[PDB]
Amino acid sequence: VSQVRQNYHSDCEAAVNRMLNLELYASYTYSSMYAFFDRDDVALHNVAEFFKEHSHEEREHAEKFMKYQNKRGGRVVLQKIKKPERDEWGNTLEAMQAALQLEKTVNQALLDLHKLATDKVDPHLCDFLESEYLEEQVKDIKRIGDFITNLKRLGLPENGMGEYLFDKHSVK
Amino acid sequence: VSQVRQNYHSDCEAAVNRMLNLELYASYTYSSMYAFFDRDDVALHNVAEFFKEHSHEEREHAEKFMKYQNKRGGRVVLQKIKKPERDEWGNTLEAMQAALQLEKTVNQALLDLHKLATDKVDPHLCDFLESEYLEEQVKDIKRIGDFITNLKRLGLPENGMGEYLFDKHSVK
Amino acid sequence: VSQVRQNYHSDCEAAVNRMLNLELYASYTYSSMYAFFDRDDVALHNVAEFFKEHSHEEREHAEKFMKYQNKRGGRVVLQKIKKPERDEWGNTLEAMQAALQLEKTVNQALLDLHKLATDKVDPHLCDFLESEYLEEQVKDIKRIGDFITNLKRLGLPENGMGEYLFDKHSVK
Amino acid sequence: VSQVRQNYHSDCEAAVNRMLNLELYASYTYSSMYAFFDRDDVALHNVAEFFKEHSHEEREHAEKFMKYQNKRGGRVVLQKIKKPERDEWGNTLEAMQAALQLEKTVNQALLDLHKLATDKVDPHLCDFLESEYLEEQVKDIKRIGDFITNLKRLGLPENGMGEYLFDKHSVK
Amino acid sequence: VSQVRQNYHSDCEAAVNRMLNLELYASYTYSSMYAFFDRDDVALHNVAEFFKEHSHEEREHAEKFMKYQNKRGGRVVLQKIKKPERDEWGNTLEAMQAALQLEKTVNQALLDLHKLATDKVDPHLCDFLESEYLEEQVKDIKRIGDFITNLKRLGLPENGMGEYLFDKHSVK
Amino acid sequence: VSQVRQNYHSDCEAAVNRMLNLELYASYTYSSMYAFFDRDDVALHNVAEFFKEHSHEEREHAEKFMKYQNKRGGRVVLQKIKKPERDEWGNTLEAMQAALQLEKTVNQALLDLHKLATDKVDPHLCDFLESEYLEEQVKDIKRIGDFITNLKRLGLPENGMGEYLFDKHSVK
């Protein structure tokens, strides 16, 4: 047992490692979206940069789980990062609907881990998840939800002018 | 094909996608080293931070290939990022030796790509490789060799004091 | 021969003179586009200014060739600058389409010159072309391609509101 | 007819297009002199720069005619730019004598245009020519004449020492 | 083999050692010229300083080759530095003609090395030579050629007044 | 005879030329040490920089004798610079020991020259040697002797940790 380990159940250590992988998968999916919107036949650079920023955010979240593992005396165990669901993301509305889906998947995993930490009576892990993940997760979901509503208002996917205006004004 | 595409061979497009993935693989390997040296039973923080910074470098190299692909009108195609070779890296010397081997693997892949771009008569790709990758590769390989020489001079793996001193004096 | 001349083939000297003339031809073509978009019955000032800047860019590229010729001990021989292919450029999308074609023509000529320099074993001329022309060319081609994608998304050529939006938001 | 056009005769419109071309032809001749004085076997750098500056001045004059045409609702029509009269310019005195003749040729054409504008009762065109062209012409002719006087005083064309001193002291 | 060595042919390693000796030889020749123009019976101090600065430049070039050798895992092997070809250099024109001959000799040796590096498929070596040597060589040759033309215009070697003026106006 | 020459014996003139060469010989020897400690299988950067600095110092000493020769109306006569005694310098201790013997050799040559200048009754030469050479010689000899004592206290050649520590602490 690690000399620093105290009140840190094996189940939670395994769950932290799975959560880290899921954060990396999300980061990679966001990188794919960045690359798509940067294509010459797509050309929505502000949208591309939005997704690049979220890729970086999700990578930072995974790195925080690595540091957390070590702080508690757990051991980081890495797995392969699966390639994203799609190679092409259709348009701004499809990609944002996919980001909403992804965010909710990550959120549900964090809520699952929080419930496990509550059940194992690990208040440090609960506090970490509340402070560093749950809040930002709700904020991100709301932001993307707001975007979806505006994209639909702007006539997406049919309305090319509306897609241009979104890139210029909602993610400028 | 893409309206921007000019003098960009399909073999080179494909090789850029493979190169991007190898850079991500190297980034992930370095992240594993960072997490190892941050363990409470290893605790070499400066060494940990050295590998963290190299994980950042390799990820930036991958992103530059993504951007490059789009510039030339190629299409980014992502694959799975394989987990690193080891979960545990032994000590600073073993880790640096592993790092040297990784850097020489990435370097050979970049030289292989440069030769393909040469055979295919693509000066833009050659120049990109020369400026953005080839010189940093040689620099990074020289630094790591220098580190290995010093670690051996310090009596690694056996000399714990030598290892402590390297971490305080050789890395940032 | 000139006292400074070394490893500079007569074919490369002649090709540099042709390349200089092609750059002046390109500069003159962009000048015509500037004057078209500045007409009272066209009146897209930011579009006009975009072509004015590219006119000034192409003229600088020709000037760089003149200086290069003297540096290597070659002799600048000027020829007539042909008038542009059109007096009127239709609209922003037709003009960008023509600019893409022109940039690809200039790019192919630079690529042909690099191939000659390679074959004639002139690495100074190869390096000049890579560092001063090839990089800029690919960037300019990517930007124009992105513009055309967005112009099509905005409903050009028929959609005047789309063309107005482009002038206000994509160029500047 | 253009919505903005008022008191702008077709003869004046046509003459502005011819004037535009002449200014470009002057600019190109000056470019040729710059390239000549930058030759390794000529090497009078300040003389070269003086001619480069005049090339720039004449191009700006052409551009101002383009803008003027549009302001009045005339239509820019571009023609081939003829290559300069010579490939090599002999020496500073011969180039300066050539420049004086070019400058008087452009001046006469501006004077003939002003006479046409007067005859056609176009005071706006008269005022434009007076403010933007006629004054600069007389100043340039005076400067070049002064230079020719000094080059002869210095024993050009035979006195190489005089030519060197001119390049160091009379041109900036 | 050195642990850092990769894609670095022994022929190139040998050629790098020969190249740095040649740079040292050129440095020493320039130092001799410095010492000659500082003589009380020559007394052309700005000419002397020009040669001193070029001696320093060529010394730095050799040192860059030593650093390069180590960066690639090659081994610096030093040889004797031959004394310069002459003990006295006649006058400014003779010395600049000698400097041109020397610069073209160095340039040819660099071009030979680039060709060897191309043949051995070493793009790292190619890029180094292009960026750090070939560009500056061409600039140095042009500058010296320009000076020769000017010394000949000023009546060298016969014209003592001309030589005085060159020292006061073309150098320092 | 030079118009400036006064109280300057031919024997002393020749001795200054011999002294110049030995300073160059010393500079080249320190350059060799610089390159050795910069090897990837040696990698003591601070020690390498120490020897680079002393290489610079001896070069400056050689230049100063060239200038002195000219000030007195003597004539600089250059001879070949012999390659250093060794291609490889063992370790910091061996290198410092070799540096001490080299410094002693240069110092004996300067004392011999001072003695000749004394016998030939040349106080200007005596004074030049005292102020510009003899004091820094004694300082440099004391510094290297101090280094050697410390390297021995540190347990060189065998104590690798001792060598690492000296590089981090005794040299700049």
Ligand SMILES: [Cl-]
């Ligand atoms: Cl416990």
Ligand SMILES: [Cl-]
């Ligand atoms: Cl769209």
Ligand SMILES: [Cl-]
């Ligand atoms: Cl009217």
Ligand SMILES: [Cl-]
């Ligand atoms: Cl210039």
Ligand SMILES: [Cl-]
């Ligand atoms: Cl000629």
Ligand SMILES: [Cl-]
């Ligand atoms: Cl190899």
Ligand SMILES: [Cl-]
């Ligand atoms: Cl150059």
